[PDB]
């Protein structure tokens, strides 16, 4: 199972939107970064909680 | 003239030189080239507009002497050469 | 990046758009980054590639008989931003001064596990390429000294 | 280090420097061009201007006017320049020509070196009154502060063998263009103190018949001035500037 | 519309000798020899002096106030 | 920095007045008369009236509602102070202002009358245009491009005769477009500058190229127009003889000052509630 | 609220009130085009 580019972009956008209006970061992040950068760091760390629903 | 160190390895020194340009940087690099204990010596300008007056240096030695000491000897050699040229010019004018 | 835009600098104007939402910014960062579209989907080939001055400089650097001094090599390494801390062994000495071949400097860009051979647009004597192709085919790991003899 | 003055003029000097390295000559040339400070007009306060030229054009023309820089009064080799302001004022009424020599300077040592530089033409009933402020500055910030033009070339010796046909034409051309020619029984040597270019008929002989050698560490320098500073003081000022820069770099290294 | 004070290339002052050059050219003298006699050696300064066209007198006749 | 038709211009040449231009814009204001005796007034608007732009916008206005000449102005600065009668209340504000993206100095103010006797005021604003990045430059042979980089004179190369180029063009643009007239013009310009006599370039009866090359060779330069050049930064001799000459270059009106537009939020169309069209609005 | 203006053609000084002017013209030569003179205050202009 691998994420597509569209699925990864949607997950990152949803996580950044969540971080913008709450949803504290689950990992340590450097100060002064954007919520998009925090979501990208979370994805790089493999800590994202958002899953993808696929047709079956 | 301000020195901002970028990184420092066991024999590598990377730093900025605020307020200077190609004139002093090229002379310093080519004077460092004269030292036999300096293995790598080079400079560059990251951007001709934003970093016009802030060249980036990189001095690597063989471990016999520190890169800071090599830069100091290069600057002293530049000073002595400039003084000698000034003395010769003053002697030749009169 | 000019060939993807088909843009020159004889008075061209271009538009800039700033995304305002987090989802739009993430979509632009993930899908529409410049490095993600190097290969053109129209023909499956490179689109973001070198142009006239890059090609001419590469030819000047990598042509036969092109050698550079230690100062020139260090200056071009600093200019290109390559992470090189020590110079390689000099290829030849002229008047007591070490010299580096342009191929040696160009080889620092390529990955250490990359192997490829082909014929370029400068091939006008196929008899010289035939010997190289036969040597490559016969052994598949030709000696570097043997290749440089009939380069 | 040796110097050989080829030609001395009130506005320019030509000399050959030996025993010096190529980036040292480049650094000296760049220091002369962009680091040696002079006096130039930086800001103009305009009271009235009825002339055809705009205020900005007149101010720029005033900035191009050379001004005498007293090197004894001010330390021109210092890394930090003195913030001394010299006021130049003019009150002229047309018709007539407005020259650079009509400006009234508040300092005797800081005056326009050339008093015959036209500035603007005034018609009948047109008057021009302003106060021009001048201060020290470097040539790298603006071209108005450049003490003059400086360039150098390699000191090369061109060897022309006597087997090359019509070598006498090359010898007489070198003599006509003011170049030193040394004649021997086997070949002639031409010292390129100026720019020497061979004709088209001698291009085929440059591979094996005519050979040019470069003297290591020898350069022919040409330094010119517009009257702001003496042509001999500019080189000394540039060398002292290099010395001060080296001292400042040593101080920063000790600070590290 | 007026002669530049300095040469656009090397900054050599040429406005002082421009009017003498124009007067000698209109008298039938060779402009090259006139430029040589005035110390104009480099062809960039010769470019500045030769290619200049005086037009300020045609602008002064119109009053703006 | 000169690739893809871009050009490189000397910093000292620009600072010495090369290719310096001034841009003029004229604004007009009329004291229009309406039905019933209502008419516009040329005066500084009071702060109590509607549509007041701000106190600092009328700082250059005189007591007659007209801007003083030789006054530095910025975007949205008031040039003619005008008021208008209200519609169906206090008088509105209808002052003529500078464009938001434009600036300069007021050159002249003209006071006159229209054909109907109404007052007419014309204000001319001039702006100094020193060449910068993005300014379009074109030669007479169809070679066009914007300024890619402004290089200081110390970094610029120089020839053995002490010649520093005012402009640097990429060699890649010349042979692809098959422009030999530009090279002939460069040779002729160098010859004309050296000799003092202008070179005739009329079609089919102009001075032959070979004659120009012979004259250049006789003048002490190379026939091909190539000169030995030294690197500005390193100071070493260039490995190739660089072709340098005098070429007539024209500065075009396509300037980056009049073309830069940036919008974040502002006025919208009444019908569609969508952003307006044009940099002026 | 009177002001001083300069004529475009004759160039002589013309004084009139813009607020209550029946006709904008020069009383000396009859020209209807006038120039607003430059103020006598000083201005600072940078030399390039
Ligand atoms: Mg285009
Ligand atoms: Zn010149
Ligand atoms: Zn009148």
Boundaries of every domain in chain B: 1-94
Considering only CA atoms, which of D8, D3, D4 is closest in space to residue D224?
A: D8
Residue D250's SS3 state is: helix
Cα separation, B37 vs B52, in Å, equals 30
Q: Is E9 annotated as a binding residue?
A: no
G13 CA to middle of ligand 3, Å?
8
For ligand 2, a single-atom ion, the residues with CB < 5 A are E 7, 9-10, 12, 42, 44-45
**Residue among F70, F108, F130 minimizing CB distance to G35:** F108
Q: Please tell me if residue A25 touches chain C, with a CB cutoff of 8 Å.
A: no
Nearest CA of chain E to the CA of F141: how many Å? 19
G27 CA to middle of ligand 3, Å?
7
Q: Are D118 and D98 in contact (CB under 8 A)?
A: yes
**Residue among B33, B39, B43 minimizing CB distance to C86:** B39
CB contact under 8 A, D153 and F230: yes
What is the tally of helices (H) and strands (E) in chain D? 4, 12
Phi, psi of D69 (to 5 degrees): -110, 110
Q: What is the greatest pairwise CA distance in chain B?
A: 51
Are D and G close enough to touch, i.e. 3+ CB pairs under 8 angstroms?
Answer: yes
Which B residues, 22 through 41, put their C-beta within 8 Å of a C-beta on chain C? 29-30, 33, 39-41
F255 CA to middle of ligand 1, Å?
15
Q: Which CATH architecture has domain F1-20+131-264?
A: Beta Barrel (2.40)
Which C residues, 28 through 67, put their C-beta within 8 Å of a C-beta on chain F? 51-53, 56
Considering only CA atoms, which of D17, D75, D20, D19 is closest in space to residue D240?
A: D75
Q: Which domains does chain E have, with CATH numbers?
A: 1-65 (1.10.10.60)
Cα separation, D232 vs D146, in Å, equals 15
Sign of the Cα pseudo-torsion (G18, G20, G26, G30, in order):
positive
CA count, 13 A, side-chain hemisphere, F247:
27
Q: Are strands D187-192 and F144-151 parallel, antiparallel or unpaired?
A: unpaired
Q: Give me the active site residues of F, please.
A: 5
Q: Please tell me if residue G38 touches chain E, with a CB cutoff of 8 Å.
A: yes
Cα separation, D144 vs D26, in Å, equals 21
Q: Please tell me if residue D92 touches chain F, with a CB cutoff of 8 Å.
A: no
F9 chain-C contacts, CB cut-off 8 A: none
Structure tokens at C132: 């190289």
Say if G1 falls within a structural domain: no
Q: How far is CA F132 from CA B34, D125, F72, in A?
A: 40, 38, 21
Considering only CA atoms, which of D73, D68, D76, D43 is closest in space to residue D58?
A: D43
G24 CA to middle of ligand 3, Å?
11
Say if G30 falls within a structural domain: yes
Considering only CA atoms, which of F5, F260, F147 is closest in space to residue C8?
A: F5
| Distance spanning both ends of chain F, measured CA to CA | 34
Cα separation, D228 vs D11, in Å, equals 10
Which residues, including other chains, have CB under 8 Å from residue F158's CB and lie 6 or more apart? D151, F164, F229, F230, F232
For residue E9, give the ligand nearest its CA.
2
**Residue among F5, F234, F259 minimizing CB distance to C10:** F5
Nearest CA of chain B to the CA of F236: how many Å? 12
Residue D59's SS3 state is: helix
Phi, psi of D30 (to 5 degrees): -65, -35
C8 chain-F contacts, CB cut-off 8 A: 4-5, 145
CB contact under 8 A, F196 and E6: no
Cα separation, F251 vs E55, in Å, equals 19
Number of domains in chain G: 1
Q: How far is CA F88 from CA F33, F50, F51, F85, in A?
A: 17, 14, 16, 10
Cα separation, B44 vs B58, in Å, equals 9
Find the closest chain G residue to E65 by CA distance.
Answer: G37
Nearest CA of chain E to the CA of G35: how many Å? 6
Phi, psi of B71 (to 5 degrees): -65, -40
Q: How many residues does chain D have?
A: 256
CB contact under 8 A, D52 and E15: no
Cα separation, F122 vs F26, in Å, equals 7
Q: Are B70 and B23 in contact (CB under 8 A)?
A: no
Cα separation, D30 vs F155, in Å, equals 8
Q: How many residues does chain E have?
A: 65
The residue ranges of DSSP E strands in D67-173, in sequence order, are 86-93, 96-99, 104-105, 118-122, 127-137, 150-161
Q: Are F28 and F131 in contact (CB under 8 A)?
A: no
Q: Which stretch of DSSP H or E encloses residue F138? A: strand F136-139
Which residues, including other chains, have CB under 8 Å from residue D170's CB and lie 6 or more apart? D160, D164, D188, D190, D198, D202
Task: Find which of F33, F60, F107, F111 to mutate to test the G interface (most G CBs within 10 Å of its CB).
Answer: F111
G37 CA to middle of ligand 3, Å?
14
Peptide bond into D95 cis (omega under 30): yes
Cα separation, F29 vs F113, in Å, equals 11
Q: Are D244 and D76 in contact (CB under 8 A)?
A: no
Q: Each residue of E30-50: b (16+ CB within 10 Å) or e?
A: ebbebbeebebebbbbbbbbb
CA count, 13 A, side-chain hemisphere, G30:
0
CATH number of the structural domain F21-130:
2.40.50.150
Cα separation, F6 vs F148, in Å, equals 5
Phi, psi of F112 (to 5 degrees): -155, -170
Which residues, including other chains, have CB under 8 Å from residue C93's CB and lie 6 or more apart? C99
Residue C56's SS3 state is: helix
Q: Please tell me if residue C10 touches chain F, with a CB cutoff of 8 Å.
A: yes
Say what the resolution is, in angstroms.
2.2
CB contact under 8 A, E64 and F108: yes
Structure tokens at A26: 């689950």
CB contact under 8 A, B44 and C75: yes
For residue F12, give the ligand nearest its CA.
2
Find the closest chain F residue to E21 by CA distance.
Answer: F196
The fold adopted by the segment(s) B1-94 is Gyrase A; domain 2 (3.30.1360)
Q: Are E64 and F108 in contact (CB under 8 A)?
A: yes
G36 is in which domain, residue-wise? 7-48
Token pair 């003899």 is found at C149
Q: Are F15 and E6 in contact (CB under 8 A)?
A: no
CB contact under 8 A, G47 and D60: yes
Residue G40 sits in a domain whose CATH number is 2.20.28.30
Considering only CA atoms, which of F223, F215, F180 is closest in space to residue F196?
A: F215
Q: How far is CA C133 from CA C116, C118, C150, F263, in A?
A: 12, 9, 11, 60
What is the tally of helices (H) and strands (E) in chain C? 7, 5
Q: Are D45 and G44 in contact (CB under 8 A)?
A: yes
Q: Angle CA(D153)–CA(D158)–CA(D161) in degrees, nearest 5?
A: 175
Q: How many CB atoms lie within 10 A of CB B92?
A: 15
Cα separation, F259 vs F251, in Å, equals 15
Q: How many residues does chain C have?
A: 151
Residue B15's SS3 state is: strand
Residues of chain F with CATH 2.40.50.150: 21-130
Burial class (CB within 10 angstroms; exposed 0-12, middle 13-18, buried 19+) of E55? exposed
Which residues, including other chains, have CB under 8 Å from residue C128's CB and lie 6 or more apart? C150
Cα separation, A30 vs A32, in Å, equals 7
Nearest CA of chain D to the CA of F55: how many Å? 26
Cα separation, G9 vs B77, in Å, equals 72
């Amino acid at each position: 199972f691998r994420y597509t580019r569209f699925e990864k972009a949607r997950i990152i956008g949803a996580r950044a939107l969540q971080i913008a209006m709450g949803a504290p970061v689950l990992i340590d992040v450097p100060e002064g970064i954007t919520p998009l950068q925090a979501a990208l760091l979370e994805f790089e760390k493999g800590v994202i909680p958002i899953t993808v629903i696929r047709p079956s | 003239m301000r020195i901002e160190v970028i990184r420092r390895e066991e024999n590598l020194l990377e730093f900025y030189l605020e307020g200077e340009d190609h004139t002093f940087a090229n002379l310093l690099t080519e004077t460092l080239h004269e030292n036999e204990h300096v293995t790598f010596a080079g400079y560059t300008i990251e951007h001709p507009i934003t970093m016009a007056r802030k060249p980036r240096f990189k001095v690597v030695t063989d471990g016999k002497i520190t890169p800071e000491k090599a830069l100091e000897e290069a600057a002293q050699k530049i000073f002595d050469r400039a003084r000698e040229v000034l003395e010769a010019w003053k002697a030749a004018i009169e | 990046v000019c060939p993807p835009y088909n843009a020159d600098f004889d008075g061209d104007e271009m538009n800039l758009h700033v995304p305002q939402t987090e989802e739009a910014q993430a979509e632009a960062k993930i899908l529409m980054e410049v490095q993600n579209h190097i290969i053109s989907p129209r023909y499956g080939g490179p689109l973001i590639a070198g142009i006239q001055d890059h090609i001419s400089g590469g030819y000047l650097l990598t042509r036969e008989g092109a050698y550079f001094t230690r100062y020139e090599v260090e200056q071009m390494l600093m200019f290109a931003g390559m992470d090189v801390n020590e110079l390689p062994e000099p290829d030849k000495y002229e008047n007591g001064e070490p010299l580096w071949s342009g191929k040696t400097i160009f080889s620092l860009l390529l990955p250490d596990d990359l192997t490829i051979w082909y014929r370029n647009k400068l091939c006008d004597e196929p008899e010289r390429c035939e010997a190289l192709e036969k040597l490559i085919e016969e052994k598949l790991i030709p000696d570097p000294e043997e290749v440089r003899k009939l380069a | 280090v040796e110097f050989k003055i080829l030609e001395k003029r009130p506005d320019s000097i030509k000399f050959i420097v030996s025993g010096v390295d190529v980036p040292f000559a480049n650094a000296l040339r760049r220091t002369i061009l962009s680091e040696v400070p002079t006096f130039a007009v930086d800001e103009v306060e305009f009271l009235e201007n009825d002339s055809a030229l705009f205020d900005e054009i007149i101010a720029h023309r005033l900035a191009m006017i050379p001004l005498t820089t007293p090197h004894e009064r001010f330390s021109l080799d210092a890394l930090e320049l003195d913030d001394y302001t010299v006021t130049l004022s003019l009150e002229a009424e047309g018709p007539g020509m407005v020259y650079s020599g009509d400006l009234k300077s508040s300092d005797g040592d800081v005056k326009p070196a050339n008093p015959n530089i036209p500035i603007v033409k005034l018609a009948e009933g047109q008057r021009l009154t302003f106060n021009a402020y001048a201060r020290l500055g470097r040539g790298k910030d603006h071209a108005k502060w450049q003490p003059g033009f400086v360039y150098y070339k390699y000191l090369t010796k061109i060897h022309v063998s006597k087997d090359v046909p019509d070598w006498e034409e090359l010898k007489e051309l070198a003599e006509r263009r003011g170049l030193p020619v040394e004649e021997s029984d086997e070949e002639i040597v031409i010292t390129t103190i100026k720019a020497f270019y061979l004709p088209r008929k001698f291009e085929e002989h440059m591979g094996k018949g005519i050979r040019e050698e470069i003297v290591p560490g020898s350069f022919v320098f040409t330094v010119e001035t517009n009257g702001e500073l003496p042509v001999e003081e500019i080189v000394s000022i540039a060398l002292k500037i290099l010395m001060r820069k080296s001292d400042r770099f040593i101080n920063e290294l000790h600070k590290l | 519309m007026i002669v530049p004070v300095r040469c656009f290339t090397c900054g050599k002052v040429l406005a002082d000798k421009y009017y003498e050059f124009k007067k000698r050219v209109e008298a039938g003298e060779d402009p090259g020899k006139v430029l040589d006699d005035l110390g104009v050696e480099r062809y960039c300064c010769r470019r500045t002096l030769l290619s200049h066209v005086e037009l300020i007198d045609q602008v002064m006749v119109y009053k703006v106030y | 920095y000169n690739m893809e038709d871009a050009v490189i211009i000397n910093k000292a040449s620009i600072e010495r007045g090369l290719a310096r231009s001034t841009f003029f814009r004229t604004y007009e204001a009329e004291e229009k008369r309406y039905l019933g005796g209502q008419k516009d007034n040329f005066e500084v608007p009071s702060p109590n009236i509607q549509g007041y732009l701000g106190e600092k916008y009328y700082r250059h206005l005189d007591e007659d509602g007209l801007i003083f000449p030789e006054s530095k102005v910025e975007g949205k600065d008031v040039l003619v102070g005008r008021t208008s009668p209200p519609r169906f209340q206090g008088r509105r504000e209808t002052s003529v202002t500078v464009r938001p993206s434009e600036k300069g100095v007021v050159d002249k103010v003209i006071v006159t009358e229209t054909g109907d006797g109404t007052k007419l005021v014309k204000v001319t604003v001039r702006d100094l245009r020193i060449p910068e990045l993005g300014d379009k430059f074109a030669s007479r042979h169809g070679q066009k491009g914007v300024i890619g980089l402004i290089v200081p004179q110390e970094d610029m190369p120089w020839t053995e005769s002490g010649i520093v180029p005012d402009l640097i063009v990429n060699p890649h643009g010349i042979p692809s477009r098959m422009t030999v007239g530009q090279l002939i013009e460069a040779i002729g310009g160098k010859v004309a500058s050296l000799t003092g006599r202008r070179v005739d370039g009329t079609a089919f009866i102009g001075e032959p190229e070979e004659k120009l090359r012979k004259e250049l060779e006789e003048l002490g330069f190379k026939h091909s127009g190539r000169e030995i050049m030294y690197d500005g930064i390193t100071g070493r001799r260039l490995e190739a003889d660089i072709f340098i000459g005098v070429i007539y270059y024209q500065r075009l009106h396509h300037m980056v000052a009049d073309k830069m537009h940036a919008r974040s939020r502002g006025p919208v169309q009444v019908l569609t509630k969508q952003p307006t069209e044009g940099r002026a609005r | 609220a009177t002001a001083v203006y300069r004529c475009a053609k004759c160039g002589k000084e013309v004084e009139l009130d813009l607020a209550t002017a029946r006709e904008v013209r020069c009383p000396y030569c009859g020209s209807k085009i006038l120039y607003k003179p430059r103020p006598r205050v000083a201005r600072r202009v940078k030399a390039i």
